[PDB]
Amino acid sequence: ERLLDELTLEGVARYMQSERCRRVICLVGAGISTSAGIPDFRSPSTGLEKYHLPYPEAIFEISYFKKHPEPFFALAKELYPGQFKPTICHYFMRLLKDKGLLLRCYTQNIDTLERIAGLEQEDLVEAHGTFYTSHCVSASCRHEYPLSWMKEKIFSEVTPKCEDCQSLVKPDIVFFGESLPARFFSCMQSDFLKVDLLLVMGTSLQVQPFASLISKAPLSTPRLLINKEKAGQSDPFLGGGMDFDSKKAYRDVAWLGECDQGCLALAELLGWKKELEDLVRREHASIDAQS
Ligand SMILES: Cc1cc(C)nc(SCC(=O)Nc2ncc(Cc3cccc(OCc4c[nH]nn4)c3)s2)n1
Ligand SMILES: [Zn+2]
Numbered sequence: 001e002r003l004l005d006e007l008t009l010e011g012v013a014r015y016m017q018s019e020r021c022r023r024v025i026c027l028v029g030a031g032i033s034t035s036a037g038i039p040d041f042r043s044p045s046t047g048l049e050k051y052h053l054p055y056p057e058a059i060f061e062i063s064y065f066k067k068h069p070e071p072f073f074a075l076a077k078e079l080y081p082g083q084f085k086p087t088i089c090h091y092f093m094r095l096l097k098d099k100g101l102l103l104r105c106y107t108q109n110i111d112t113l114e115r116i117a118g119l120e121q122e123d124l125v126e127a128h129g130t131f132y133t134s135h136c137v138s139a140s141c142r143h144e145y146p147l148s149w150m151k152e153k154i155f156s157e158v159t160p161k162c163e164d165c166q167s168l169v170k171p172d173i174v175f176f177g178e179s180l181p182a183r184f185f186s187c188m189q190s191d192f193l194k195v196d197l198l199l200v201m202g203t204s205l206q207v208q209p210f211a212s213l214i215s216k217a218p219l220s221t222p223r224l225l226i227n228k229e230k231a232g233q234s235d236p237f238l239g240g241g242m243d244f245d246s247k248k249a250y251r252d253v254a255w256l257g258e259c260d261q262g263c264l265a266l267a268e269l270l271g272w273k274k275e276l277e278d279l280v281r282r283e284h285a286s287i288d289a290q291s
Contacts, residue, residue: 138162138165
C-alpha cells in the first residue's frame with residue numbers, strides 16, 4: 001500500500017509528478033555546498049593555534065566570543081568564501097519553489113547560498129543560523145546589521161561594534177551555548193503535518209536536533225537521500241531511522257553519489273533538465289559578472 005511504486009530515483013520522480021505529491025520538505029547540509037567551494041568544517045580533511053585559545057572549542061562558544069571575540073573574527077576572515085555561487089542542488093530547490101512544490105527548506109548551512117539561489121525567508125529554516133544578518137548582542141538594543149556591513153568589518157579586521165551602543169555585533173549563527181532558533185521548532189511542528197516528500201541532500205544526519213527531523217515525517221511519507229554515503233539508519237549500538245534495504249523497506253530511497261549529480265538526475269527524470277540548466281547558467285553568469 002506504499003506511495004512509491006519502486007524504491008528508486010525513478011519511483012520518486014513518478015511519485016513527484018503524481019497528484020499525491022504536492023508538498024516537499026528539503027533537509028540540506030554541508031554536502032550541498034562543497035561543490036560551491038565551501039568546505040564542511042566537520043569533514044576532517046577540511047576541518048588554529050595562531051589563535052591562542054584556552055581550549056580549542058572556545059572559538060565556537062558564545063561566552064568566550066562575548067569576552068574575546070577577536071579569534072572568531074580572524075577565523076571568519078580566514079574562512080570567508082571567495083565567491084558565493086549556489087550549486088545545482090540550490091537551484092533545484094529554487095525550481096521546486098517556482099513550481100509550487102517547496103513547503104520548506106531546512107538547512108544546516110550558514111553560507112547564505114539558499115538565499116542567493118532565490119529561496120526567501122519564508123521558505124527557509126536556517127537551523128544553525130546564518131551569516132546573512134548580524135545583531136548587536138545587547139538585549140536592550142539588538143540592532144540588526146546586514147552581511148555587507150559585517151563583511152566590511154571582517155575584512156578590515158575591525159571588531160564589529162554596534163553604532164548605537166558599542167556592544168559587540170555577532171553574526172546570526174548559532175554558537176555553542178546558544179539555543180537553536182525558535183523558528184526551527186515552530187516550523188517543524190507545523191510543516192511535518194503537511195509533507196508529502198522528504199528530500200534529504202548533503203547531510204550525514206549526525207548533528208542533533210537536525211537529524212531527528214527525519215523521524216517527524218508521517219509514516220507514509222517517502223524519504224529520498226541524495227548523499228555521498230548512506231546516512232540516517234539506526235545505529236546498531238545506540239539504537240524512525242531510514243530503512244533502505246531490508247525486506248520491510250517501503251518508502252526510503254538512497255541515491256549515492258555527488259549531490260549535484262543526483263539532483264541533476266532527478267530533474268532530468270522530471271523533465272526539468274533544460275529549465276535547471278538555463279537557470280543555473282543564467283545565475284552563475286550573473287554572479288560571475290558582478291562589478
Ligand atoms: C565567514 C563566512 C561568511 C559567510 C557569508 N559564509 C561563510 S561559510 C564558511 C565557514 O565555514 N565560515 C565560518 N566562519 C566561522 C565559523 C565558526 C563557527 C562558529 C560558531 C558557529 C558556527 O556555525 C554554526 C553551527 C553551530 N553548529 N553547527 N553549526 C561556525 S565557520 N563563512
Ligand atoms: Zn547595540
